[PDB]
Symmetry: D2
Subunit: 431 residues, 4 copies
Amino acid sequence: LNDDATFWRNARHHLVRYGGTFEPMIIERAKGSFVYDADGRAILDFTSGQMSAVLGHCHPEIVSVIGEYAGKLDHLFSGMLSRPVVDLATRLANITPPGLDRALLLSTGAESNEAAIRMAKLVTGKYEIVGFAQSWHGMTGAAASATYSAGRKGVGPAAVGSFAIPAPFTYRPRFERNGAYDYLAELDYAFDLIDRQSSGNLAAFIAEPILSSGGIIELPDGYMAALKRKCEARGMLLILDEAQTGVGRTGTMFACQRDGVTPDILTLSKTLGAGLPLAAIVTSAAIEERAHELGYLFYTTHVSDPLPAAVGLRVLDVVQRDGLVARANVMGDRLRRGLLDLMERFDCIGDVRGRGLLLGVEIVKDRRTKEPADGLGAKITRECMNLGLSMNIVQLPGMGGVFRIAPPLTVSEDEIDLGLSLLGQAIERAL
Amino acid sequence: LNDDATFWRNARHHLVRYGGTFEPMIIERAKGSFVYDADGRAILDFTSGQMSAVLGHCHPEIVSVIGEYAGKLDHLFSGMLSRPVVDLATRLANITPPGLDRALLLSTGAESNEAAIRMAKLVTGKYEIVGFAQSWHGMTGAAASATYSAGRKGVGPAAVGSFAIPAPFTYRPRFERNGAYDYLAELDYAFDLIDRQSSGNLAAFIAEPILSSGGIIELPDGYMAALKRKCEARGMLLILDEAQTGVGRTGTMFACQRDGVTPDILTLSKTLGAGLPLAAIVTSAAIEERAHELGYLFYTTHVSDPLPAAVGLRVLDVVQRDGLVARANVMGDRLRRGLLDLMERFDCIGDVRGRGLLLGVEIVKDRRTKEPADGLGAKITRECMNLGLSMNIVQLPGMGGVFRIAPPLTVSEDEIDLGLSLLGQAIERAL
Amino acid sequence: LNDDATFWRNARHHLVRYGGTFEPMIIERAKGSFVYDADGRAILDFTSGQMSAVLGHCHPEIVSVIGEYAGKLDHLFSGMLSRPVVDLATRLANITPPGLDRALLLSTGAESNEAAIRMAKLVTGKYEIVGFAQSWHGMTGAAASATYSAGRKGVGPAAVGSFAIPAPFTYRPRFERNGAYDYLAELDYAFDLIDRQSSGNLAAFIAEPILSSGGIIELPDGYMAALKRKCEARGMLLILDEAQTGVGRTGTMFACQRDGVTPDILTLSKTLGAGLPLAAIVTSAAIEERAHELGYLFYTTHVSDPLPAAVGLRVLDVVQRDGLVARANVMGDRLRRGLLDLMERFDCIGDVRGRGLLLGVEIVKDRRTKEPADGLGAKITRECMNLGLSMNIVQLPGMGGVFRIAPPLTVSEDEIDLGLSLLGQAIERAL
Amino acid sequence: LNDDATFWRNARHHLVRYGGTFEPMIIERAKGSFVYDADGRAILDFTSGQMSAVLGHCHPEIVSVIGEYAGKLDHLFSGMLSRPVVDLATRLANITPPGLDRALLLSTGAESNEAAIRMAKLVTGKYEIVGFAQSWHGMTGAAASATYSAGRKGVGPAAVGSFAIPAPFTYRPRFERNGAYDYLAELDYAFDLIDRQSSGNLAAFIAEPILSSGGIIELPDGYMAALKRKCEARGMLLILDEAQTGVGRTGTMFACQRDGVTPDILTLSKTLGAGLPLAAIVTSAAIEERAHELGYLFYTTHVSDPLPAAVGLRVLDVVQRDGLVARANVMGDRLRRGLLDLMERFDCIGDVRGRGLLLGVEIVKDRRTKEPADGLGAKITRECMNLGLSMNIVQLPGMGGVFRIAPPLTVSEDEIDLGLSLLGQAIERAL
Ligand SMILES: *Cc1c(COP(=O)(O)O)cnc(C)c1O
Ligand SMILES: *Cc1c(COP(=O)(O)O)cnc(C)c1O
Ligand SMILES: *Cc1c(COP(=O)(O)O)cnc(C)c1O
Ligand SMILES: *Cc1c(COP(=O)(O)O)cnc(C)c1O
Ligand SMILES: [Li+]
Ligand SMILES: [Li+]
Ligand SMILES: [Li+]
Ligand SMILES: [Li+]
Ligand code: NA
Ligand code: NA
Ligand code: NA
Ligand code: NA
C-alpha cells in the first residue's frame, strides 16, 4: 500500500517543502507512458514527468547507453574532452538552423539560461535584460530575475536592469487597434516604454516560443519576426529558451524552425536530457569568437561530462531515427481533436491551445464571460488522479486554470485515447 | 592516437570555449584513480575529475545502482515521492549534526546555494548577503553574486546587497594586532565595516569551510565559532557550502564536524553525486517550518528525482561501509608527508596546506620573500601531464599559483606514491 | 553691447556647460515681465525665468522683505525655530486642502521630492517607486531615478525598484478600447504590468498634475482619482509634485484642488520661492506621526531657515491679497484665445493645451499627419528672440517640439498682447 | 518670552519633525557671532548656524549686496548669462589651484555632489562610487548613497555600486603594522578589498578633507596623496567635498591647498553662500570638455542665477580683503589653546582635534580607557545653552560624543574668550 507509515513519517520529518503538495502515493516503478504506485496501479503520465521524458520512462535505448557509459566514462575534469561531448556538440550544430554552430554542454535549464545571459552581456557590453511578464526561465540568479511567472515576491530586489513586457495572449486580448487585437502594435507600445526606462544598456531579450509555465501561450504569427527586428534595431541579442519546446515536441525539431526566425543564442534542457540532467546553449561562431576574445568563462562541475552527453546523443538518434517529430504531429492531432470534442461536451472548457504534443486547456466558469473557474480545476485534477491520469494545472492571475498536457513523443494511440477517456470522466465527475 | 583530425576539427568548429584550454588528448575510458587516453596511456586523476569523483571513476557499486534505477525509476513529476528520495533525505538528516533535519534534493552546487540563499531571505525578510572575497559558490545568479574568486568583471552589476569580507589567510597574513596575525580581530574589523554599509537588511553569511577555488585556504581555529557569533548577533543565517569538503574528504563526514559549529543551512553537491549531478540543502525543522509558512518555493526540473537520489544513497553507503572517512585521514597523512618531503627538496614549494585529502601546494619564487612564481606553475603542470599526472593549478591575485590536490577517497597507497614520484620528477624537470 | 570680449572670453574659459547653449546676450537688469540686455533692449520673459518668477522680476514686496530679513534674521542652526518658518508652515497647512497639515521647509524641488520619497519608504517599509515615462522631478538621486523625461542614459544604473508607466496623452493617443482612447483602461493595463514586475514592495507613486518638462501634458478628467485608487489598493502613497503648477499658476491655488484628489504628500518649489530657493513638502498629521515614530531624518543646510521662509510667506500674501489666482484664469483665457487665433492663421500649430497660465503649443509638419516639425521650432524660437520674446521649447521623442508658455501671474493685458504679436511675427518670419 | 503659546501650538501642529528636537526658544534676531531669543538674550553662535555663516550673521556687506541685487537682477532662465555668474566662475577658477578652471553654480551641497558624481560617471563610463564609512555628503540621491555617517537604514537599498572604506582615525587606531597605526597600510588593505568586489566599474572616490559629520576627523599627513595615487592607478576621479572646509575655515583658502593634492573635481557649498543657498563644482578644462562632448546635462531651477552668485562673489571679496583666512589661523590658535587648557582641567575631554576654526572635542568616560561618555555630552550641551553658548554634538557608534566647534571667521578675541569661559562653566556644572 501507499499508506506506509514509516515512509510517510520520514517524509514529513525530513523533507523540505518546496511548493505544491506531495501526491499521496509512493511511486515504485515507471515504464513508457506510465508510472506505478505501491499498489501496482498504473498511472498515465500525461506530463512526461516534469515535462521532460520525451521518450517515456526507462526507454531501453537510454537504459542501454546509461549502462555502457556508467562503467566506461563518467565524469572528467572540465578541460578534458571526450567523444560524446564533441559528437553531441557537432550533432547540435547540424540539426539546428544555419547560424547556430557552437555548443556548451551543461546540466540544467537555469544554467543554460545563465550561460546565455552572461555571454550576451559580455559580448554587448550592456546589462539590461528584457523578458515576458509571464516567463519561466528557472530559479537560479539571472534566469530567476528574467522569470516573471512566479517567485518574485518576498525574496528581495531582483537583478538590476530587468524589464518585462506583456506577452501576446490571443485568448484574452487587451490591446486593440481599430477594433482588433493588434499584437504587433502591442509590441511597439511595450518597446517604447522600455526605451523610456532603459539607461541605454539593452543587452538581450529572452523568450520562450510557447510560454509553458505562463499558461501554454503561443507567440502568434509574425510575432517572433517582429521581436527579432526590435532587438536588431537596438543592438540586442535574442535568446530563445526551448526547454520545453525543443527536441520535437511541437512538431518541428525546434520551435524556431516553424517561424523561421533563428535566435542569436538557443538554450535547451528538459527534453534534451529526456529525464536526466543535461542542458546546452547553441550560438553562432561569430558570437562565440567574440565572447572568447572577451574572456568569456562559465565553469560548472558537470560541463562537458561524458555520461550525460552520451545520453543526449542517444536521445537525438532515437528521435531522428524513429521519426518522433512527425509522430508528434500525428498524435498531437489526435489529442487535439479529442480535446475539442470534450469542449463540445462541457461548457467549462474555454480554450484548447498549444502545438504538437504541448497542449493547454483553459478551464472557465462560462464560455462567454470567460470567467476563471474558482476551484473546478482542482476538482478535475483530483478526479483524474483517482481515475489514474496524471495531470498538472497552472493558475495565473487573471486567467482560468490551465491544464498542461504533454505526453511522451512515444505515446501510443491507445494511451491517447485512454487519457482522453479518463479526462472526460473526471470532468463529468467534477461538476 | 590523440591526434584525430576529425575529432579536433569538430572540436574547434563546434564547441563554445568556456575558460581554460582543452587538454590535447582524447579521454576514452576511466577507471578508479585513472583516466586513459586514446593511446591507452593511463593518467592518474589527482583531482577526482572536477573535485567530485570521491569513489573514483566507474565504481562498481555506483555502476550497479545507476543500472538498477535507470531501468526501473528515472524521472518523475516534482510532486511525486519515491523511496530513494525519502531514504536519502532521511539518511542526510541522520548523518549530519543534530539541528540539521530536513533536506531538499537538487542537481547542482549553484542550485543548492540558491535554494539556501532564497530560504534565508524569505525567513529573515532581509536581502543582504555576505561572503568571502575569495569565495566560489557557482555561476548562477545569487550564487554568482556571492562568488568573489572570479567572474565579477565585464558582466554588469552584481546582485544588490552583496558584501564581501577578507578571508583569514595564515600563509600571507595582513592584519596584525600586537605583533601577531590576529584573525579574530580582522573579523571584527571587517564586520564593523559591513555594519556601516548595510541598509539594515543582513540576511545571511555564506562560507566554505576550506576555500577551494580561493587557493585551498582553511578557516583557522576558532574562526567559525566567532563567525557564527557574528551572525547570531545580527539575526543572520549562516550557510555552509560543503561542495568540496563534504562527504569525508577532509577526514570528517562534514567539515563543520571538526569545528563543532553547526550551520543554519548546509549545502552539498560535488562529492554527494560522486560525478553525477546531485545536490542538496539540509536545514533545521524550525527554519523549514517557517519557510513553508512563508510560502517558500523552489522548483527545478530534477528536484526529488529517483535516479540521482538512488545514486547519492549508494555513495553514502559505500563511504560509511568502507570507512572511507578514516581512510581519508590515513591517505591524507601519507600524501601530506610526501609533499612535505618535496618541500624539503625544492625551494619553490612555499606552503603545504589543507586537510585530509583536500590539499594545496603554493608555488613561490623564493621561500623567504614568498614572491609568487611567474610561469613555473604552468611548467610544472605541463610536465606532470607529460609524466601522466593530472593536476590543476589556480592562480589568484597576490598569491603564488596553487596546486589543488584531491585524489579519490579510494586512492591506494601505491597511487599516492606514484603521484608523489611523478610530481617530484615534473618539478625537477621544470626548473 | 552684448559683445563684450572679456565677458565672453571668461565665459568660454570658466563655465561648465550644463545643457543647451548660452543665449548670446548679457542680461543686466530685470523688472516685472521683462529682462534687459546690455544694450537696454527689453525682452518679454514669457517663461518667468525657469518657470519660477510667479510675481515677475524684482517685485517690490519681495524686494522689501528680502531686505528686512537679510539684516535681521538670516540663517540658523537646524534646531532653532523662528517666526517665519512657523508662520509659513502654518500658512501652508491652512491653504492646502484638509488632510495636508504638516510642512518641511527646504531649498529645492529635488530636495522636496527626495524628502517625500524618503518619508514614503520609511512609512511603508517598502522601496519601489512608480512615476511617469515623461516625468521631471529633478536631478538629484531618487528624484532623478523617478525622472524619465531626460538624463537616464550614460550615467550608470538607476535606483533599484524604479518603474514607469506611460502618461495619458490625449493629443497622440495610443491605447484604444472600443474605438476610443481609453485612458483609464490604459491605466489598468499599465498597473497590471507593474504588478507583475514588482517584488512586492510598492511604496509610492510620484506624479505631476501637468507634466511640464514632458510637453505640457495634462492628466485628463477622472485620471487622478483613478490613480489614487490604484495606489490605495496597493498600500502606496501618492506624492504630487506641484513645482510648476502650485501657487496659482493653473487657476487654482493648487492643481490638486481642481480634481478634488488630495495627495498623501504634496511637494512645492519653483513658484513657492518666486525665483529664490525655497521648497517644501506638506503631509498629513498621521503620516508625519508615523514617520517620526519610525525615526525619519532629513537634514539639509538650509532646512527651516528664516530668510527664505520670510520670502515664501510674502509670496503667499501677495498672491492671496492681489487675487492672482483669479487673474491667472482671466489672463490665461486671454493668452489661450490668442494662441487659438494663431492656430487659425498657421497650419504648423498642431495643439494648444495647458491650463491657466501654464500653456503648451505643439508645433507640427502638418495638422493631419501630426508629423513633428523638424527644425521649425528652433527657427521660431530664434526669431522670437530677435523680436524680443523669450521662449522655451522642448522636444521629446515621438512628439512635435513644444513651446512652454508661462508668464508671470502679474502679467498685464498689454504684455499678453505684445507677446502674442511677436509670436505671430516670428512664425511668419520662420516659414 | 520664548513661551508663546500660539507659537508653540502652531509648531507642534504644523511642522514635520526631521531629526533632533527643536530648541525651546524663539530666535528673533541675529547679528555677528550671536543669535537673540525672544527675551533678547544673546546666544553665542559657535557653529555659525549650520556650519555656514563664515562672516557671521547679517554682515553688512552681504546685506548690502543682497540688497542691490534683489531689486536689479534676481532669477533668470538657465540659458541666460549675467555678470555675477561669469565673475564668480572666473573668481573661483583664479583662487583655486591650477588645474581647476571651470565652475558650475548651484544651490546646495547635495546638488554639488550630484553634479560632480554625474560628470565622473559620464566621463569615465563607469558607475561605482567609493566613499568613507563616516562620510556626509548630503541627503539627495547619489550624494546620499555615498553618505555613510547616518540615514542608511530603513529606507530601502542604496545606489548600485556603492562601496565604503574606513577613514583614517588617529585617535582610535585599529590597523597596526609593526607596532604602529599604519594608515597607509590600512588604505592598501581597504583598496584590495574594493578591488575584489568591484565589477570593474570604478568611477570615482568622494572624500571630505576633514570629516565633519563623522566626528571632525582629519585625514592624516600623506593620506591624500596616497589616496589620489590609488585613484589614478584605477582610472578613477577624485572628488573633494569642501562644504565645510572651503573658504578659509581651516586656515587655507581650500583644505586641499595644505596637502598640495588638487582633486579632479572640487565641490563647495555651506561656506560659499555664507548662509544663503549657493553651491558649486569646479573642474579642469579637460574634464569639462569631455563631459561636454559626451553630452553632460545638469539642470536645476537655480543654476546660474544672478542673486546668489552676486552674494558668493561678495563673500570672496570680503574673505580676501579682510584677510579672514589668516585670521582663521590666529583665532583658531587662540581657541585651540583654550580647549587644551580645558583638557588640563577636566579628565572628560579626551581629544582636541581639527584645524583652523573647524575644531572637534571628544568627550570620554576616562582618558585612558577612552570609553565614550554615556549621557555627559548631552548634559554639557544643555548647560551650555543655559549659559548662552550654542553648541552641537555628534555621536557616532564606537566613539565618544563630539563637539563640533566652528565660529565665524569674523569672530573676535573676546567672543573666543567668552565661549571658552561658558564652556568651562558648563562642564563644571555637568559633572
Ligand atoms: C524548466 C525550465 C527552465 C529551467 O530548467 P531547470 O532544470 O528547472 O533549471 C528554464 N526555462 C524553461 C522555459 C523551463 O521550462
Ligand atoms: C563547485 C562549487 C559550487 C557549484 O557547483 P556547480 O555544480 O558548479 O554549480 C558551489 N560551491 C563550491 C564551494 C563549489 O566548489
Ligand atoms: C524643476 C522641477 C523639479 C526640481 O526642482 P529643482 O530646483 O530643479 O531641483 C522637480 N519637479 C518638477 C515638476 C520640476 O519642474
Ligand atoms: C552639508 C554638507 C553637504 C550637503 O549640503 P546640503 O546643503 O545639506 O545639501 C555635503 N557635504 C558635506 C561635507 C556637508 O557638510
Ligand atoms: Li567533466
Ligand atoms: Li522528479
Ligand atoms: Li537654519
Ligand atoms: Li537662472
Ligand atoms: Na545549425
Ligand atoms: Na542531523
Ligand atoms: Na491643509
Ligand atoms: Na584654479
